[PDB]
């Protein structure tokens, strides 16, 4: 089940999730969705039945509305008048029975309840014997996530990517960081591969001592 | 609505030995038609989707070891996990699917537990263009320690800092089990360069004396 729709929204706006089921049938399954706030714990959402009919947690009845119709293999959350508590990763939650609610998963699709416009991160430098440091400071981005990869997904050993601090601005901020031997500097190059899809930047950094 | 309460909620025991995590339905979910309990357990890594474990209250489901098992029936369960492996570091959590809505247990975060280990210590002054967009942030790294617990003070011309700093620490590494921490000290440029020393100081169960690393503006 791969989870899409999921993106930046204002207030009151609204939002369509899709589901691919590409493994097994959406017919012949029952199919729900569960979130999860971040940081937090699971919430149940919606289910609509092999069968057809509908039911709906208290905090979503009216506002969502669950939709099925066996296209390309496809499930669907129709969300309408959106809070700010609505703000979550949504999950497709594939049953294995009728009254048989053993959850399975895909990957999740991140809602952000936001009036904010999409703002792309800058990237500085974090400049480096036995064991140097050094990293990338990935600054004021709004929203999440960003992902870092260091010499294209090529160097892992080391790499500390933290996670990102909310900071008094409202933007966000992370660090990635890796450990390296220091005769090793001014030979092999080190650089960070950015990537903040929301607001589809990509920015590729050297990390010079 | 099933109320599902999990205790404990937080959780850290050492390789090889036993964790175990217990669970409370306000209601019996034991259906007296196959008399099979309608309790699961999950396990959710991070940034991973909660993955089944046991399903019927103490039923596996394939492709789950052996070591861990669920038991309990009706209000009460229980899931235990013998010999906690590296790859068992997660969140876990109970839910219910006797009666819609399906409800879940707020979950319990179930570390691994070693030996103290001493954090390495980096200091980073603010790179050259961010000085060009008017501000510095000076960054300080503690690498790879145990346990969690770690006190960074900034000191700036050995005057302390209070409120202009945040942090992050980084999910327990599943490979060695040590954690690691960011510090970023964010001023204006107007504000850094004002003063001439800035120290980063780290305060760990490690340390056998606190460990500064400092830096004067410019060098």
């Known amino acids: 089940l791969v989870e899409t729709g999921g993106g930046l929204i204002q207030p009151g706006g609204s939002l369509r999730l899709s589901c691919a089921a590409s493994?097994?049938?959406?017919?012949?399954?029952?199919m729900s969705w569960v979130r999860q706030a971040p940081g937090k714990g699971l919430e149940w959402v919606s289910v609509?039945?092999?069968?057809?009919?509908?039911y709906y947690a208290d905090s979503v009845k009216g506002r969502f509305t669950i939709s099925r119709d066996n296209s390309k293999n496809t499930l669907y959350l129709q969300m309408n008048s959106l809070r700010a508590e609505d703000t979550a990763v949504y999950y497709c939650?594939?049953?294995?029975?009728?009254?048989?609610?053993?959850?399975?998963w895909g990957q999740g699709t991140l809602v952000t309840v936001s009036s904010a416009s999409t703002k792309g991160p800058s990237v500085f430098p974090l400049a480096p014997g036995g064991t140097a440091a050094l990293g990338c400071l990935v600054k004021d981005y709004f929203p999440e996530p960003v992902t870092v990869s260091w010499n294209s997904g090529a160097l892992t050993s080391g790499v500390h990517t933290f996670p990102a601090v909310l900071q008094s601005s409202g933007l966000y901020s992370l660090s990635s960081v890796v450990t390296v031997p220091s005769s090793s500097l001014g030979t092999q190059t080190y650089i960070c591969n950015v990537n903040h899809k929301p607001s589809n930047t990509k920015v590729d950094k050297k990390v010079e001592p | 609505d099933i109320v599902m309460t999990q205790s404990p909620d937080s959780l850290a025991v050492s390789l090889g030995e036993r964790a175990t995590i217990n669970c409370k339905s306000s209601?019996?979910?034991?259906?007296?038609?196959?008399?099979?309990?309608?309790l699961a357990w999950y396990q959710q890594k991070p940034g991973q989707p909660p993955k089944l474990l046991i399903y019927?209250?103490?039923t596996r489901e394939s492709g789950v070891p052996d070591r861990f098992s669920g038991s309990g029936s009706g209000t009460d369960f229980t899931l235990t996990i013998s010999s906690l492996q590296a790859e068992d570091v997660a969140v876990y959590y109970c839910?219910?699917?006797?009666?819609?809505?399906?409800?879940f247990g707020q979950g319990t975060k179930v570390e691994i537990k070693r030996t103290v280990a001493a954090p390495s210590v980096f200091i980073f002054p603010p790179s050259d263009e961010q000085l060009k967009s008017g501000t510095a942030s000076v960054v300080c790294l503690l690498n790879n320690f145990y346990p969690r617990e770690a006190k960074v003070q900034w000191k700036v011309d050995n005057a302390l800092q209070s409120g202009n700093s945040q942090e992050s620490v980084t999910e327990q590494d599943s490979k060695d089990s040590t954690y690691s921490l960011s510090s970023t000290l964010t001023l204006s440029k107007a504000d850094y360069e004002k003063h001439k020393v800035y120290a980063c100081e780290v305060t760990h169960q490690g340390l056998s004396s606190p460990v500064t690393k400092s830096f004067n503006r410019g060098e």
């Open positions: 939650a594939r049953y294995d029975g009728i009254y048989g609610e053993l959850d399975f």
């Open positions: 493994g097994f049938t959406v017919s012949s399954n029952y």
């Open positions: 609509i039945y092999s069968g057809g009919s509908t």
């Open positions: 209601q019996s979910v034991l259906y007296s038609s196959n008399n099979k309990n309608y």
């Open positions: 019927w209250a103490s």
């Open positions: 839910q219910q699917y006797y009666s819609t809505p399906l409800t």
